[PDB]
């Protein structure tokens, strides 16, 4: 129950010990979801880094957004993934929104306020309820077993999630910075706990 | 008798079984026509895909808009075609309007709100009336005999047709998104029937 408007988390150096953990009040099995976030780093030309990592008892990576060297964004909703391609890389803050549903299996990778393509994946798979939502390092277990290679150094914020599939217009409003009501993870009112070397600072990005 | 404003058809994967079919009330032999549509895919760098396919009893391809690898748009009004060239390819939604008349045989390929050139073809040829307007795969017969290579994966919408030759200004208004009255196929009020894996979703493109 705290606000983080105009604030962002900063990871100064690479380390497999520093990370934040977010908690949610979800109780029912997720079937269709959407997420949005902003981040800023420069590790692209050096190695791969983990952007978003979920967690469940049975599977290490229920939902996972990662960056693969010379490949681009990789999005996994289970034991499968899509390989979204990015030809060139620049240095600047980046927004990214994604959505998925079990009924159809479609996915949309909204990047910088623009769409890429609709693609199909894991039609029928139902997501779990209990989670350990870590941020800072990808985990291969319930909040543990981190590898320093995937560690992220830089800053991130503006994280938000919904349990429904947003229409193609509310994404534009999110991109423009308007007022809306997340139902799972709300940046306006959030609960978290942090360990290691992490700091909170005004978002340098616009 | 249904509306599809702000909606679009989505083909998730490649398959020669999924397709939609549109019906029209035409009764007289078409002599001059015009069409307009919007589509979005990324198959250009991989193979050729069929954009629009007509059908008649005597000829498999009465009217056909196709994309040829490293060549560009190909437009056939019968046993003849024009080879419209596109030097470079990008990834983004695309509009395309075309028109033809039997009296003169001229053709205009309006792309992204811009013209290319006037060219001549099949002056005298009269089009048929009965049709099987398929969308999703090119057909070499009356609605049958599909080849998976030509299948389209992506999304498409905003389809409209007229039985006259529009002046160079109404095309601009179409491009800007204004209200007009198609006389053959009307996106505002349309009849269709779909088979296979196809979905209806809000148009991600603007």
């Amino acid at each position: 129950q705290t606000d983080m408007s105009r604030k962002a988390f900063v990871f100064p150096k690479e380390s497999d010990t520093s990370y934040v953990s977010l908690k949610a009040p979800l109780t029912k099995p997720l079937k269709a979801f959407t997420v949005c976030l902003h981040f800023y780093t420069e590790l692209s030309s050096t190695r791969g880094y983990s952007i978003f990592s979920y967690a469940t008892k049975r599977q290490d990576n229920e939902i996972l957004i990662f960056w693969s060297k010379d490949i681009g964004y990789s999005f996994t909703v289970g034991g499968s993934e899509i390989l979204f391609e990015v030809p060139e890389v620049t240095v600047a803050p980046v927004h990214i929104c994604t959505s998925w549903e079990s009924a159809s299996g479609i996915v949309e990778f909204w990047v910088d306020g623009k769409p890429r393509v609709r693609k199909s994946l894991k039609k029928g798979y139902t997501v779990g309820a209990e989670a350990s939502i870590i941020l800072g390092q990808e985990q291969d277990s319930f909040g543990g077993n981190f590898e320093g290679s995937q560690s992220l150094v830089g800053d991130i914020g503006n994280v938000n999630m919904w349990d429904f599939v947003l229409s193609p217009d509310e994404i534009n409003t999110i991109y423009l910075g308007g007022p809306f009501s997340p139902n799972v993870l709300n940046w306006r009112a959030l609960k978290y706990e942090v360990q290691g070397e992490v700091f909170t600072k005004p978002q340098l990005w616009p | 008798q249904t509306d599809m404003s702000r909606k679009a058809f989505v083909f998730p994967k490649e398959s020669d079984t999924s397709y939609v079919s549109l019906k029209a009330p035409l009764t007289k032999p078409l002599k001059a026509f015009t069409v307009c549509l919007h589509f979005y895919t990324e198959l250009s760098s991989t193979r050729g895909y069929s954009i629009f396919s007509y059908a008649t009893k005597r000829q498999d391809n009465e009217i056909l808009i196709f994309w040829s690898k490293d060549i560009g748009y190909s437009f056939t009004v019968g046993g003849s075609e024009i080879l419209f060239e596109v030097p470079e390819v990008t990834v983004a939604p695309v509009h395309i309007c075309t028109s033809w008349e039997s009296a003169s045989g001229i053709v205009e390929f309006w792309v992204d709100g811009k013209p290319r050139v006037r060219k001549s073809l099949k002056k005298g040829y009269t089009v048929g009336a009965e049709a099987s307007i398929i969308l999703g795969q090119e057909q070499d017969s009356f609605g049958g005999n599909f080849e998976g290579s030509q299948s389209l994966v992506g999304d498409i919408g905003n389809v409209n047709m007229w039985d006259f030759v529009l002046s160079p200004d109404e095309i601009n208004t179409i491009y800007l998104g204004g209200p007009f009255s198609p006389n053959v196929l009307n996106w505002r009020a349309l009849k269709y029937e779909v088979q296979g894996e196809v979905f209806t979703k809000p148009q991600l493109w603007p």
Partner: nanobody
Amino acid sequence: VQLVESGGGLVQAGESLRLSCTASINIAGLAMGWYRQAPGKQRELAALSTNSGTTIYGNSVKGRFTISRDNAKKTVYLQVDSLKPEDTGIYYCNVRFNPDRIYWGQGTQVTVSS
């Protein structure tokens, strides 16, 4: 869980080469590719075939080889051409499903006769 390779090194400067790989698993939902490991440096990615109708290519070697995705079987191809001296080294090949699970291949060495 399994992997097999077929190819030869000792190739002359500029000529072609055909390498191949096989496994005991379907390729549906498995992006398969090739990585290069020259002396020193580090194991890098030559090029791979996406899951659905696309082929990523290593920036270093543009228009260098072809992914030649196999279907119904496991037989990846490169169609080497314009073999230059810098091509010498190990050529790893593997299929990775999801990050942290790639079941690394064994790779095959290739030399460049001057």
